[PDB]
Design a protein that fits this description.
elongated; 5-nitroanthranilic acid aminohydrolase (chains A, B); deaminase; part of a larger assembly; alpha+beta; binds manganese (II) ion; 3 chains; about 35% helix; Nitroaromatics; hydrolase; 6 strands; binds 5-nitrosalicylic acid; Alpha-Beta Plaits
Chain lengths: ~210, ~210, ~425
Amino acid sequence: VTVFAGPSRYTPYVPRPVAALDSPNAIVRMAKLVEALEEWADNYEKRYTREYGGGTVVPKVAIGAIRGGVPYKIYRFPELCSIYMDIRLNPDTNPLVVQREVEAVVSKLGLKAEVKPFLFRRGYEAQGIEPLQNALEVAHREVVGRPTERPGSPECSMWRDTNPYNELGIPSLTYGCGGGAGGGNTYFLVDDMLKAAKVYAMTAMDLCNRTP
Amino acid sequence: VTVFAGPSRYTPYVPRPVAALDSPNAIVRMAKLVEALEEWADNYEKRYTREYGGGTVVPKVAIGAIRGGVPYKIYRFPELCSIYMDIRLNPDTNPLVVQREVEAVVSKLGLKAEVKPFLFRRGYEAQGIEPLQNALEVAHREVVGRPTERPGSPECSMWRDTNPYNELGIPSLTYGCGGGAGGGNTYFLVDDMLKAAKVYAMTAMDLCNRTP
Amino acid sequence: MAGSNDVAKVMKTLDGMREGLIQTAVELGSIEAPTGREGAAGDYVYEWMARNGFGPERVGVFDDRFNVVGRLRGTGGGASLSFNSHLDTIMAREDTARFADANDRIYHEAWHEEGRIYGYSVVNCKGPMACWLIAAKALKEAGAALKGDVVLTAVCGEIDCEPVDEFQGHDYLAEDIGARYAISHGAISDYALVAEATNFKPAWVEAGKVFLKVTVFAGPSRYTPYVPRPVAALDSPNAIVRMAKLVEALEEWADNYEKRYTREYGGGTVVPKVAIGAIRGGVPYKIYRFPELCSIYMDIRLNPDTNPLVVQREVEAVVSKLGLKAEVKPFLFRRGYEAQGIEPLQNALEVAHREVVGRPTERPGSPECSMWRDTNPYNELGIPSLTYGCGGGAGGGNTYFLVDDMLKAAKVYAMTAMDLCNRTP
Ligand SMILES: O=C(O)c1cc([N+](=O)[O-])ccc1O
Ligand SMILES: O=C(O)c1cc([N+](=O)[O-])ccc1O
Ligand SMILES: O=C(O)c1cc([N+](=O)[O-])ccc1O
Ligand SMILES: [Mn+2]
């Protein structure tokens, strides 16, 4: 998201006082856009929460980077300033819909901006997962002792490589020990790692002996 | 000015909703510092305006650059974010005093920050300027036709190379045709350029024939 | 003010760091680091400050010639004090053109024999540098209460090397990329103490300087079998010969220059001196024709109130009185300053000095007020600054410090900080 302003002025000529949204300094305007975008994000994750058999997807939003202009030439404030947003999608959300929502936040503030997508990947729920699901379930109850529980939302609402497999028709799930690093967990119990390796092996012995 | 926050979280784990000033995303907190610094800046130029024989100094403030973190790794928001400020000084202001004021703005918001100077240069009013002043005045009245006026404040309140000369004991002023580029003027009238070259020449013929 | 009971604790700590003080000086003095190659010395100080948690920054114009700046941060609301010394040393092993034996030992090395530390690199200037490094370490480890920051500034290029003619850029610069660069790019503070060797005598006046290149003209060039003889020296076609005459006229001017421009300031009495530091003309590998020109290079110190153009005209007159044609061209100008508003640092130091050294401070020796030290950049930029350390100056030239004296200076440095850094700006 690049917000435009201007005209550029050498610091001894900058007009003051001026309303934030009218500032010639694009950094100043962006700061106002950021709090509007944070509230939009607060409501986004709730509006687009969606439950699937494979888990509940809670799609979140973060502002991951900002810049404008360059640190080694600061005697003129920037005519532009960019923000970089990570916006997670549930499998059923079109990226263009999200872009218009953001274009609208900007429009409500009366700002001139460019909202440009530079990454798009689709999320998927597995189709025909039952054989792997079952093979794993059997192994899990043997090694861990109880039925499996429904996954925590953050671990359903990220990017993991189940997506490429699913996209290409290889039914796929994710499973391992410990809390996610995004959490952030910083360790594994050696005993749990051993448990997992056992589950992985058992899963293989079931599944790899079926005829396709 | 670097604002600190954290802890870093993978986008699917970001806590919402959170008050801006309590946000784990330093960019979010920074937006809030930017508003406080913009108000402080509106008042700074008035509080430190000061009138001298060589002109009236109106010292301004601009935020010239912002960044955090990097655009090519945005899946975790930054724990820090930096701002880069141009703060003009009248010849009589200690830089450390200004730093304390900026640290105070930060403190009033309950933020943890580093306010670190990376540039300091002094401004000067000329001493013992009269002979040059006089030669120039005379030449100016012959070529332009009326007396010189007191300069516009932005042209007194910037950085020009009169400062190194005055610092080193060489009485020095600035003088030319047209509006300043920080203005921003984008052309000169050839007639005005010719007038200046005449004023320069006459100034030289007077002054360089005076005894030191 | 200085703490009552918190001083004794810090002093005790300093008594226990004596050998650490010694090794630091010796290791530091041992590094080959003449002006132009202080890189390695900077690297040492950076990792020393880093280990002791002063969070150093490299602040420089080149990646191999830089200043090192760290801080000992205070609780809040106090005055800042800089401690400053320089990383370069005087003699390079290269320099057979100014010294009779460029490769002595005292010129390049540093060792602890007897409870003394020998070496020009220690007198100027790693001895005093070690002192405040240790003082800072003591303050930090003793948990001394300081409201203000202590800024630790180790600079490059203090020694008066300057570029001229075909000698340009990285290899020949000094002061332009040293302290004044560091201060201009962050190393600012309320007051500054420059640790160089005075003898426990504070100085807060220093001299400026103007360097003149004087080229005398003659001619016409003649192949040696054609040179006209006999001719009065001042009429010689050989510019070398005429210069020889100008040289004794300039030496006479110099004997009187220093006396005429002696001036007494509160910060010390300035006796500004003159030396001819170099001569050349023309080239050694083509001597079959004498030169039509010959240049001389003069170091002329200025008191704080003398315009360099005034001095240039005096030299031009000397040339004129001999009936010679010459170009007197300046290729270096720096101003000297007396500290303004120095009293708080003066007082903090005075009290400390009397606790440790035992007697009042005396007025400084003239050469130490009439030289170039890094007080000039600090004062030029509005940071009141004085000089103070142990031992005799290398310009003397002294060649050693007493360890007992170094321990004393480090103690004086600490007390000064404990006083000053708790005053309100
Ligand atoms: O699987 C994860 O937890 C995970 C976390 C991050 N991250 O916190 O940035 C990135 C990729 C991951 O797979
Ligand atoms: O002299 C000026 O007007 C001037 C303007 C800028 N600027 O607008 O960035 C910089 C240097 C200047 O001298
Ligand atoms: O500080 C000094 O004593 C000093 C001496 C010389 N020198 O003797 O050539 C040069 C630079 C100095 O700072
Ligand atoms: Mn020195």
